[PDB]
Amino acid sequence: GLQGTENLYFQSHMTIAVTGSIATDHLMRFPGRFSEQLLPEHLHKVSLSFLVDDLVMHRGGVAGNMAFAIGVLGGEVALVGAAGADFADYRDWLKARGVNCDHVLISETAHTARFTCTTDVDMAQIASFYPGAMSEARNIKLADVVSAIGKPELVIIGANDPEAMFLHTEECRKLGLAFAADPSQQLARLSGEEIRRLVNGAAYLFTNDYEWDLLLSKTGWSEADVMAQIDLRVTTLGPKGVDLVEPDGTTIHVGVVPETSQTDPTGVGDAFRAGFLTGRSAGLGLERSAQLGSLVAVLVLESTGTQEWQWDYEAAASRLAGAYGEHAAAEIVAVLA
Amino acid sequence: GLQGTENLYFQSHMTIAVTGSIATDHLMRFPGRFSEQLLPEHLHKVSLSFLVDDLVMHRGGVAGNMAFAIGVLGGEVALVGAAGADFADYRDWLKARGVNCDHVLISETAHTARFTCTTDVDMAQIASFYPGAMSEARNIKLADVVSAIGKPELVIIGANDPEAMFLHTEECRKLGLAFAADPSQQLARLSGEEIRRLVNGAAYLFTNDYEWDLLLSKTGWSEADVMAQIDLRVTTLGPKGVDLVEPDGTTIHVGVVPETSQTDPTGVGDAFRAGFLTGRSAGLGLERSAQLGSLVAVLVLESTGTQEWQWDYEAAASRLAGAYGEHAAAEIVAVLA
Ligand SMILES: OC[C@H]1O[C@@H](n2cnc3c(-c4ccsc4)ncnc32)[C@H](O)[C@@H]1O
Ligand SMILES: OC[C@H]1O[C@@H](n2cnc3c(-c4ccsc4)ncnc32)[C@H](O)[C@@H]1O
Ligand code: NA
Ligand code: NA
């Protein structure tokens, strides 16, 4: 009754655009411990052959995961990445949860990227990633996306074809789009200069604490050097929670939702980021948004695959209330409706 | 009219029954050296994430590989192993090459086994094997196979479901079938008692030199102890060739066919065994048979996948002539054509 129809519709098009990998995750379980059974002698002429007792294929890719979670939580999200012609079923899966997939580049030749991962009983991982169609993400122009769906409220620059990451970030700077620097695995692979090129001007920087130290080491930046380039640092601390740090040093710390199981750590970070950014878009403060992100992250930790979790108001509210109090759980549920 | 009809026909029989794994091989290439970047410090908290720049899916499994090679070379072969309902195209692939697949067990529920392997530029490997339908190989009775195709000249007991390996070997002993003990990868996993149970009474023992030392260590056997249990030992020595050793110590040594490239070592041993045993079934002597096996082995070494090589009498003859002399090449081609 009190909504301005014109202005509400005007803003409805301001989506989150998620750029990053789109993949199939081929996940296997090793019924042992890599750290214990592997010995230093096995690394000098490497020949490893693990017997695995489980194998499942699931939808994945950092951008696929984040878009799935934003869509499931009710946000407005567009998936912007490269995949192969095999993508049809994945497309239907994402569209059924509200994800705009019109601007997924479909390669004429290459298959969708593949993440192959063997996880042991202690959640340690030995994995390989095949880019396939992901390399063609460097041919996506965010200008065309904007022309089609309008200026997004935020562009997430997740792990992707590296050249696509640099081009997307620079196009955000040029078009005045707010972006979240979420380089994740590429922090292990890029040079300090390249990383600096991904961070400058970011509305958000997302890393975990290890990745934060890695970024500082490789870039040669101090923390103050980074905070001069970004509006907010979000650093996940695993079971120790998450820090949200403004440029003036103001820090908000949020604890985690305790897990009922540690099934598979794949996609936990993606899910935290998706939940946090959905909460922020929905009007929640930094602390409440991080609390939502922590819930989604633990739901991914407790399931095999990255998009196999389920959203249930009653269970979500109960776990949020247990971790953060009934008032916080109520505010979170109130914005998600 | 100088042929002895009885003995001619007596020698004419050459059916080989191949037991062992049937699989799809998911092969990837790491464009670097594991040795350059994997260090003992990475064992504390194991978390490896390789970028691979090639991914292909190929027909595989040790029994599939050996049956393919025997069929391609003109031998008489039946494939005896467990697969999944996905096996249909694989079946057509093998039948088109003369392989009898009537006695492949098709699981009602499980997928064909899967070998996932990353190989670096120095041929080092990191791999995982998911048995799936392979476990159901323990339900295959060689008595039914014999009832269908008659008493084979040889049963190859290759890497398989371990219980199936034991059941097949004991059924060969009870039914009086000559068998080749080819446990290969299972030598890394079985106990000395189990290995001894696989070797006793073998017509052939096939291993590489490392596997030979491993067998001797785990079984507690000396070489003479082994030679008292088997009719012929075949020990491959990689670039140093192959030793063929009778119980009385009589040794035939054969050098290798020089390779034109070192592309992928997966299935090279399978191919040697198949070529050697086909040559023997066709009436070639030990040396000529090992020369044929060495050719097939290098053809697999030079190609991606285990069954992607091509059999061409003229190219084969030229390489055999270069390695072993025109007389040997001619004798081999004359028997196979
Ligand atoms: O966040 C979890 C998600 O990350 C996805 N992924 C896993 N490795 C990668 C890499 C990579 C690795 C070595 S070099 C580049 N790049 C881009 N996405 C990846 C995976 O598909 C999973 O669903
Ligand atoms: O010899 C090359 C062929 O061996 C096949 N293979 C690779 N690992 C195995 C294993 C195994 C591994 C760890 S525990 C048991 N078992 C049975 N076959 C295998 C593969 O499908 C390839 O085509
Ligand atoms: Na998970
Ligand atoms: Na090969």
A317-321: list long-range contacts, CB under 8 Å, 24+ apart. Answer: A319/A257, A319/A295, A320/A257, A320/A291, A320/A292, A320/A295
Best residue among A51, A52, A55 to mutate for probing ligand 2's pocket (most ligand atoms within 8 Å of CB) is A51
Q: Residue B115 Cα, ligand 2 centroid: separation in angstroms?
A: 6
Residues with Cβ within 8 Å of residue B181, at least 6 apart in sequence: B157, B169, B198, B199, B202, B204, B205, B206, B230
- Experimental method, per PDB record: X-ray
Q: DSSP letter for A239, please.
A: G
Q: What is the resolution of this structure in A?
A: 2.1
Q: State the Cα–Cα distance between residues A193 and A211, nearest whole angstrom.
A: 16
CA distances from B119 to A20, B54, B116, B322 (A): 27, 10, 10, 30
* Helices marked H in chain A: 5-12, 34-37, 62-72, 88-95, 142-149, 162-175, 192-199, 209-219, 223-227, 268-281, 286-301, 313-324, 326-336
Q: State the Cα–Cα distance between residues B254 and B324, nearest whole angstrom.
A: 9
Q: State the Cα–Cα distance between residues B59 and B83, nearest whole angstrom.
A: 12
CA angle B257, B260, B261 (to 5 degrees): 115
Q: Are A236 and A242 in contact (CB under 8 A)?
A: yes
Residue of chain A whose Cα is closest to the Cα of B49: A127
CA nearest neighbour of B18 among B88, B91, B100: B100
Name B56's bridge partners. B27
Q: Known binder of ligand: residue A61?
A: yes
Q: Would you call B46 and A131 a contact, using CB atoms and an 8 Å cutoff?
A: no
CA distances from B173 to B110, B152, B156, B177, B200 (A): 30, 13, 13, 6, 9
Q: State the Cα–Cα distance between residues A185 and B151, nearest whole angstrom.
A: 58
* End-to-end CA separation in angstroms for chain B: 22
Which residue is closest in CA terms to ligand 2's atom 5? B61
Which strands sit side by side in the sheet containing A204-208, from one edge to the other?
A99-100, A77-80, A16-19, A154-158, A179-182, A204-208, A232-236, A242-245, A251-254
Best residue among A25, A26, A62 to mutate for probing ligand 1's pocket (most ligand atoms within 8 Å of CB) is A62
Other Cβ atoms within 10 Å of B11 Cβ, number: 12
Residues with Cβ within 8 Å of residue B158, at least 6 apart in sequence: B18, B19, B20, B21, B62, B63, B66, B182, B183, B184, B270
Q: Would you call B49 and A132 a contact, using CB atoms and an 8 Å cutoff?
A: no
When scoring A36, A46, A111 by the number of chain B Cβ atoms within 10 A, the one with the most, hence best to mutate, is A46
Q: Would you call B185 and A52 a contact, using CB atoms and an 8 Å cutoff?
A: no
Structure tokens at A248: 């003036």
Other Cβ atoms within 10 Å of A229 Cβ, number: 15
Q: Are B19 and B157 in contact (CB under 8 A)?
A: yes
Q: State the Cα–Cα distance between residues A275 and A254, nearest whole angstrom.
A: 14
Phi-psi sector, B107: left (phi>0), alpha (psi -120 to 50), beta: beta
Q: State the Cα–Cα distance between residues B177 and B170, nearest whole angstrom.
A: 10
Q: Are B210 and B218 in contact (CB under 8 A)?
A: no
* Residue of A34, A116, A129 lying closest to B116 (CB–CB): A116
Q: What are phi and psi of A202, to 5 degrees?
A: -70, 135
Q: DSSP letter for B73, please.
A: T
Question: Cβ(B112) to ligand 2 under 6 A?
Answer: no
- DSSP string across A51-85: E-SEEEEEEE-HHHHHHHHHHHTT--EEEE-EE-G
Residue of chain A whose Cα is closest to the Cα of B38: A43
B270 is catalytic: yes
Q: Are A82 and A101 in contact (CB under 8 A)?
A: no
Q: Are B83 and B106 in contact (CB under 8 A)?
A: yes
Q: State the Cα–Cα distance between residues A302 and A270, nearest whole angstrom.
A: 14
CA nearest neighbour of B61 among B212, B274, B295, B302: B274
Domains and CATH numbers, chain A: 1-337 (3.40.1190.20)
Query: Which of chain B's residues have a Cβ under 8 Å away from the Cβ of A114?
Result: 55
Structure tokens at A272: 């935290």
Q: Residue B116 Cα, ligand 4 centroid: separation in angstroms?
A: 14
Torsion of CA B331, B333, B334, B337, to 10 degrees: 160
**A329, exposed or middle or buried, with CB in 10 Å at 0-12, 13-18, 19+?**
buried
Query: Which of chain A's residues have a Cβ under 8 Å away from the Cβ of B129?
Result: 49-52
Cα Dmax for chain A: 72
Among all ligands shown, which has an atom nearest to the Cα of A31?
A: 2
Q: Would you call B51 and A189 a contact, using CB atoms and an 8 Å cutoff?
A: yes
Q: DSSP letter for B14, please.
A: -
Q: What are phi and psi of A310, to 5 degrees?
A: -125, 145
**A169, exposed or middle or buried, with CB in 10 Å at 0-12, 13-18, 19+?**
buried
CA nearest neighbour of A46 among B40, B42, B125: B125
How far from chain centre, in Å, is Cα B118? 20
Q: Are B199 and B219 in contact (CB under 8 A)?
A: yes
Q: Are A247 and A233 in contact (CB under 8 A)?
A: no
* Residue of B40, B118, B188 lying closest to A40 (CB–CB): B40
* Residue of B38, B44, B114 lying closest to A35 (CB–CB): B44
